[PDB]
Design an enzyme around this catalytic site. Sequence first.
Site, PDB file in Angstrom:
ATOM      1  N   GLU A  49       0.886  -1.324  -0.026  1.00  0.00           N
ATOM      2  CA  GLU A  49      -0.133  -0.001   0.156  1.00  0.00           C
ATOM      3  C   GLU A  49       0.761   1.362   0.190  1.00  0.00           C
ATOM      4  OE1 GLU A  49      -3.809   0.372   2.177  1.00  0.00           O
ATOM      5  OE2 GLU A  49      -2.817   1.944   3.004  1.00  0.00           O
TER       6      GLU A  49
ATOM      7  N   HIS B 204      14.386  -4.568  -4.154  1.00  0.00           N
ATOM      8  CA  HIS B 204      14.639  -3.896  -2.696  1.00  0.00           C
ATOM      9  C   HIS B 204      14.089  -2.797  -2.182  1.00  0.00           C
ATOM     10  CE1 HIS B 204      16.569  -8.572  -3.074  1.00  0.00           C
ATOM     11  NE2 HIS B 204      17.168  -7.656  -4.055  1.00  0.00           N
TER      12      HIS B 204
ATOM     13  N   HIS C 287       6.159 -11.439   2.449  1.00  0.00           N
ATOM     14  CA  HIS C 287       5.081 -10.871   3.306  1.00  0.00           C
ATOM     15  C   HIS C 287       5.582  -9.873   3.694  1.00  0.00           C
ATOM     16  CE1 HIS C 287       9.009 -13.203   5.151  1.00  0.00           C
ATOM     17  NE2 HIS C 287       8.388 -14.072   5.083  1.00  0.00           N
TER      18      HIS C 287
ATOM     19  N   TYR D 274      10.635  -0.742 -11.965  1.00  0.00           N
ATOM     20  CA  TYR D 274      10.972  -1.873 -10.718  1.00  0.00           C
ATOM     21  C   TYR D 274      11.992  -1.537  -9.892  1.00  0.00           C
ATOM     22  CZ  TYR D 274       9.629  -6.269  -8.245  1.00  0.00           C
ATOM     23  OH  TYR D 274      10.256  -7.154  -6.904  1.00  0.00           O
TER      24      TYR D 274
ATOM     25  N   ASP E   6      11.262  13.950   3.280  1.00  0.00           N
ATOM     26  CA  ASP E   6      11.340  12.460   3.282  1.00  0.00           C
ATOM     27  C   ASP E   6      11.908  11.702   3.409  1.00  0.00           C
ATOM     28  OD1 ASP E   6       8.995  11.175   4.818  1.00  0.00           O
ATOM     29  OD2 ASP E   6       8.161  10.151   3.095  1.00  0.00           O
TER      30      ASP E   6
HETATM   31  C1  5I1 Z   1       5.525 -12.228  -4.131  1.00  0.00           C
HETATM   32  C2  5I1 Z   1       4.895 -11.003  -4.749  1.00  0.00           C
HETATM   33  C3  5I1 Z   1       5.187  -9.962  -4.738  1.00  0.00           C
HETATM   34  O1  5I1 Z   1       5.967  -9.967  -6.136  1.00  0.00           O
HETATM   35  N1  5I1 Z   1       5.813  -9.316  -3.761  1.00  0.00           N
HETATM   36  C4  5I1 Z   1       6.083  -8.809  -3.252  1.00  0.00           C
HETATM   37  C5  5I1 Z   1       7.865  -8.408  -3.874  1.00  0.00           C
HETATM   38  C6  5I1 Z   1       9.035  -7.111  -2.948  1.00  0.00           C
HETATM   39  C7  5I1 Z   1       8.097  -6.693  -2.611  1.00  0.00           C
HETATM   40  C8  5I1 Z   1       9.384  -5.622  -2.008  1.00  0.00           C
HETATM   41  O2  5I1 Z   1       9.505  -5.892  -0.514  1.00  0.00           O
HETATM   42  N2  5I1 Z   1       9.909  -4.870  -2.655  1.00  0.00           N
HETATM   43  C9  5I1 Z   1      10.803  -3.566  -1.972  1.00  0.00           C
HETATM   44  C10 5I1 Z   1      10.774  -2.207  -2.378  1.00  0.00           C
HETATM   45  C11 5I1 Z   1      10.572  -2.113  -3.387  1.00  0.00           C
HETATM   46  C12 5I1 Z   1       9.054  -2.364  -4.325  1.00  0.00           C
HETATM   47  N3  5I1 Z   1       9.410  -2.621  -5.862  1.00  0.00           N
HETATM   48  C13 5I1 Z   1       9.259  -1.388  -6.544  1.00  0.00           C
HETATM   49  N4  5I1 Z   1       9.283  -0.457  -8.012  1.00  0.00           N
HETATM   50  C14 5I1 Z   1       8.958   0.285  -7.675  1.00  0.00           C
HETATM   51  C15 5I1 Z   1       8.594   0.895  -6.980  1.00  0.00           C
HETATM   52 CL1  5I1 Z   1       8.361   2.692  -7.798  1.00  0.00          CL
HETATM   53  C16 5I1 Z   1       7.603   1.405  -5.539  1.00  0.00           C
HETATM   54  C17 5I1 Z   1       7.324   1.948  -4.325  1.00  0.00           C
HETATM   55  C18 5I1 Z   1       7.578   2.706  -4.204  1.00  0.00           C
HETATM   56  N5  5I1 Z   1       6.476   3.589  -3.601  1.00  0.00           N
HETATM   57  C19 5I1 Z   1       6.075   2.683  -3.226  1.00  0.00           C
HETATM   58  C20 5I1 Z   1       5.184   2.217  -2.242  1.00  0.00           C
HETATM   59  C21 5I1 Z   1       4.442   1.101  -2.128  1.00  0.00           C
HETATM   60  C22 5I1 Z   1       4.631  -0.116  -2.448  1.00  0.00           C
HETATM   61  C23 5I1 Z   1       6.211   0.057  -3.103  1.00  0.00           C
HETATM   62  C24 5I1 Z   1       6.511   1.274  -3.720  1.00  0.00           C
HETATM   63  N6  5I1 Z   1       8.477  -0.382  -5.017  1.00  0.00           N
HETATM   64  C25 5I1 Z   1       9.972  -4.255  -4.043  1.00  0.00           C
HETATM   65  C26 5I1 Z   1       6.716  -6.653  -1.481  1.00  0.00           C
HETATM   66  C27 5I1 Z   1       6.344  -7.490  -2.664  1.00  0.00           C
HETATM   67  C28 5I1 Z   1       5.758 -13.513  -5.089  1.00  0.00           C
HETATM   68  N7  5I1 Z   1       4.895 -14.878  -5.360  1.00  0.00           N
HETATM   69  C29 5I1 Z   1       4.805 -16.196  -5.878  1.00  0.00           C
HETATM   70  C30 5I1 Z   1       4.524 -14.218  -6.653  1.00  0.00           C
END
Ligand code: 5I1
EC number: 2.7.11.22
Lengths: 248, 325
Positions: free
Chosen positions: B20, B103, B325, B100, B144
């Site tokens: 979220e 991490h 998770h 994308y 931020d």
């Molecule tokens: C699980 C399904 C799956 O893909 N779950 C999942 C993977 C990775 C994350 C996760 O923890 N991250 C780390 C935070 C970065 C996020 N990637 C990302 N890329 C671009 C952008 Cl612009 C953002 C982002 C920017 N602002 C945000 C707010 C909230 C969320 C993201 C975000 N983030 C990846 C979490 C969950 C496997 N299943 C088997 C399919």
Amino acid sequence: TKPCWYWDKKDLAHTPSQLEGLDPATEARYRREGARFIFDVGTRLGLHYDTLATGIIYFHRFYMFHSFKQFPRYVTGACCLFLAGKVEETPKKCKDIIKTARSLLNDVQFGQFGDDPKEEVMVLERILLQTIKFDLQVEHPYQFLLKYAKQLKGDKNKIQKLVQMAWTFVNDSLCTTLSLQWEPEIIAVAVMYLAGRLCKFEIQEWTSKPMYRRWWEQFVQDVPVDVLEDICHQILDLYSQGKQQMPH
Amino acid sequence: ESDWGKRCVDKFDIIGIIGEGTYGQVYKAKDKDTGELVALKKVRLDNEKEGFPITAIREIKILRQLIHRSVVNMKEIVTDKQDALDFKKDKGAFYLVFEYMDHDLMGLLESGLVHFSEDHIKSFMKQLMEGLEYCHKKNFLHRDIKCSNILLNNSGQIKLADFGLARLYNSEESRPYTNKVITLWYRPPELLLGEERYTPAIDVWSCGCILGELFTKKPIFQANLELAQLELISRLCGSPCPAVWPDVIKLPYFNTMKPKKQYRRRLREEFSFIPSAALDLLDHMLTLDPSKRCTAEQTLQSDFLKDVELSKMAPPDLPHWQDCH
Ligand SMILES: *[C@H](CC(=O)Nc1ccc(C(=O)N2CCC[C@@H](Nc3ncc(Cl)c(-c4c[nH]c5ccccc45)n3)C2)cc1)CN(C)C
């Protein structure tokens, strides 16, 4: 990266409304009326001049992609102002724009808004954003009118008169499609030129190079006198058989 | 390319929810055409009182002006689907398309499965301060910065993210800004004491907390309230006082908020285990007086980051995937 927001005289004669059979004089009037609507509504809500101008630019751009026969003037005007407040950090509740729209417009004009005025504006925002290609940042002639006028050196009352006249002509220009034709830097220089001519001021005598007739070349690069004459003529056309009277 | 908004979300395949955000769900996805990974910030608008969120408008305004390697860039904006012949019935939503990233920095540290070396920290900070220099040079404050807003992919590329709460800065003359900004743990002392006319120094403080956090594997100033947060900063950095910070007496909460005692600065003691050049940088970055504090340009000119060649640096052994998770 960023889209092009400038059209030729030929392209401005082939707008979506013209293609649907609306004559140029009527489109001119719809554009005049819609700009003044945005201007009057925002002024009653006490909004900054850039907010008004941003609203009006969105409005002029909208009707290069859509026809007035499919989208009523004042609804679009209201929607353009509503979005402009949010973009320019002077937001207003849509509720208040409708309220202020009601007081200014007659019953036939306000009929455009239909049964639920707010809903008609909120719905249109989706399309407005798509139409302007999410290119929200817009600069206007006023800031350049001020920047270039601060650099002039001479009689402070006459310069003030120039700036005050020029300011009025920027407001007038927003009724026209000039913001679709020329950059805000150019329109700023053009209104100074217009005021100076009407006031019988020779602006070159207030510049760093008193002798040289093309005073504007220190502000705006590579702009011939014919362009400024054409901008002036379009602004002065607004006073011709429109029965308006110009400042001072 | 520039014709944003009119391309359809059909063009992407939604892999799943990431998390979220501020104004909706965020989704991982793959482009059907180019096969390229993205994040999709969904922006709903049938709901909500004043239509398209102003917070999204701000983020769009800023990200279109910021073009840099180590800054998260907005690729395009994309829509749902709009029925036969009635836009008034159509009440879908928009999606902001971002590259994308595998991490975020909070996730990597919280797992305890990753260890960053001096060379890894060098590379991260080099990249972070380059993007931050760029933003400050274009008169923008992030407001931020924290571990959850520093994203990192598996090929070693760092990106500063989340310009939702960013703002333009006037350098030619001072002006008043919103006081309560930055999550408490990374918030500078001037904001705690109630400064409204603040500088790009606020972002450098946050980056300083991160530099320390990369060595300790845990946030260095970790508390729940403003008063406690200032207490913790003072313990390590010294109590705010005029000898160190002349203009501190001008701040609203200098007499209301005070530490227990006048603490001495002991950052060099508490971070003795860190390298010397790294310690020099951390000290300059966590200087209490913002006018004495390090600028982003100056950090790049420091010994710790001066000669860091990023193409020559090899990528870190990062975890592949998460177990959702
Ligand atoms: C699980 C399904 C799956 O893909 N779950 C999942 C993977 C990775 C994350 C996760 O923890 N991250 C780390 C935070 C970065 C996020 N990637 C990302 N890329 C671009 C952008 Cl612009 C953002 C982002 C920017 N602002 C945000 C707010 C909230 C969320 C993201 C975000 N983030 C990846 C979490 C969950 C496997 N299943 C088997 C399919």
